[PDB]
């Protein structure tokens, strides 16, 4: 069955190139987690793009962390060369990103989209 | 107040941002939408794929529509114009008709995704 994609992000927020002043990268499961460890005391929202089949979110395509002004400070992207991530890989990557950002005293929330994927896997 | 939009797409990110060109250009601005079609494309099988914004499980606004051949070439497009006042559901329906009619005139077989079919049927 062909997939459709449900996103929280505009096409520009998904393709905008961003960089970290203080890079931090971890690879967990088959996902790449990035976070600018220079960002502190900001209000962050995690926004995602999922592939959706039969009204249920299936796979993570892109996850991006945005400040209230709109700057990209973090990202969770799959690695194409590596075998497909599971629902557990995604949940763990979210916790890794959240924990990392909160360590720099950043307030972080997720969209209903992420909340529904997590709760259902 | 106002509710935040999510986006439901038929296309991968690369499909939405891939650059393409018409060997025989045909363009028009209708309502507040830009309609493009390569008038050099003939006797092909085409599918129209779209990206719509959504609030409360109902498609609201067109973000981008593209026309793909079975091989994956982009032959047509419907995009909103940001400087112009927001297009309606009727503008979109008409633009799709204009694109379909145009492509059928060159003996192309044209079909739409379920996403477009649902937007049209509901507006």
Q: Which residue has the tokens 């694109």?
A: B99
Number of residues assigned to chain A? 121
Report how far apart, in Å, the C-alpha atoms of A39 and of each of A68, A74, A95 are: 13, 10, 18
In terms of CA atoms, which chain B residue is nearest residue A47? B6
End-to-end CA distance of chain B: 23
C-alpha–C-alpha distance, residues A29 and A93, integer Å: 8
| Positive or negative: CA dihedral B9, B10, B11, B17 | negative
Q: Which residues contact B61 (CB under 8 A, 6 or more apart)?
A: B5, B52, B53, B80, B86, B87
Compute the distance between CA of residue A109 and CA of residue A115 in angstroms, rounded to an integer: 10
**CATH number (domain holding residue A60):** 3.30.420.330
Distances (CA, A) of B110 to A63, A71, A99, B83: 34, 41, 49, 30
SS3 A38: coil
CA of A33: how far to CAs of A17, A66, A76, A80, A90, in Å?
A: 15, 14, 5, 14, 10
CA distance B51 to A11: 10
- Which of B6, B17, B64 is closest, CB to CB, to A7? B6
Nearest to A29 by CA among A99, A114, A94: A94
| Distances in whole angstroms, Cα of residue A78 to Cα of each of A29, A118, B106, B111, B113 | 9, 16, 41, 32, 27
Is A1 near chain B, with CB under 8 Å?
Answer: no
**What DSSP designation does B59 have?**
E
| Closest among A3, A65, A40 to B15, alpha carbons compared | A3
Q: For chain B, what is the domain count?
A: 1
**φ, ψ at A53 (rounded to 5°):** -135, 130
Tell me the CA distances in angstroms from A32 to A25, A27, A82, A97, one per residue in order: 7, 5, 11, 10
Q: CA B65, CA B63: separation in Å to the nearest integer?
A: 7
How many CA atoms within 13 Å lie on the side-chain side of B54?
Answer: 21
Distances (CA, A) of A17 to A69, A75, B105, B115: 16, 11, 41, 29
Of the candidates A5, A8, A15, which has its C-beta nearest B9's C-beta?
Answer: A5
Max intra-chain CA distance, chain B = 49
Residue A17 DSSP SS3: coil
Cα separation, B66 vs B46, in Å, equals 10
Instruction: Retrieve residue A26's tokens.
Output: 């971890």
H helix runs in chain A, sequence order: 11-15, 87-102, 112-120
Q: Would you say B16 and B9 are in contact if contact means Cβ atoms under 8 Å apart? A: yes
Pairing, β A43-53 against β A107-110? parallel
- Cα within 13 Å of Cα(B75), Cβ side: 26
Distance CA B80, CA B115 (A): 18
**Optimal mutation site among A4, A61, A116, interface B, most CBs of chain B within 10 A:** A4
Are the CB atoms for A98 and A107 separated by under 8 Å?
no
Q: From residue B95, how far is each of A10, A12, B36, B45, B119 by CA, in Å?
A: 22, 24, 10, 19, 13
Q: CB-based contacts of B21: which residues, under 8 Å, 6+ apart?
A: B38
Resolution value in angstroms: 2.8
Q: Contact at 8 Å (CB) between B116 and B48?
A: yes
Residue span of the structural domain in which A9 resides: 1-121
Please indicate if any CB of chain B lies within 8 Å of the CB of A7: yes
> If phi over 0 gives left and psi between -120 and 50 gives alpha, with beta otherwise, what is residue B85?
beta
């Amino acid at each position: 069955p062909a997939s459709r994609y449900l996103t929280d992000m505009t096409l520009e927020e998904m393709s905008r190139d961003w960089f970290m002043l203080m890079p931090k990268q971890k690879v967990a499961g088959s996902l790449c987690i990035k976070m600018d460890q220079a960002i502190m005391d900001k209000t962050i929202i995690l926004k995602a793009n999922f592939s959706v089949i039969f009204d249920r979110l299936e796979t993570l395509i892109l996850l991006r962390a945005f400040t209230e002004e709109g700057a990209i400070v973090g990202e969770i992207s799959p690695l194409p060369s590596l075998p497909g991530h599971t629902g557990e890989d995604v949940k763990n990557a979210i916790g890794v990103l959240i924990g990392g950002l909160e360590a720099n005293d950043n307030t972080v929330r997720v969209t209903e989209t992420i909340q529904r994927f997590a709760w259902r896997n």
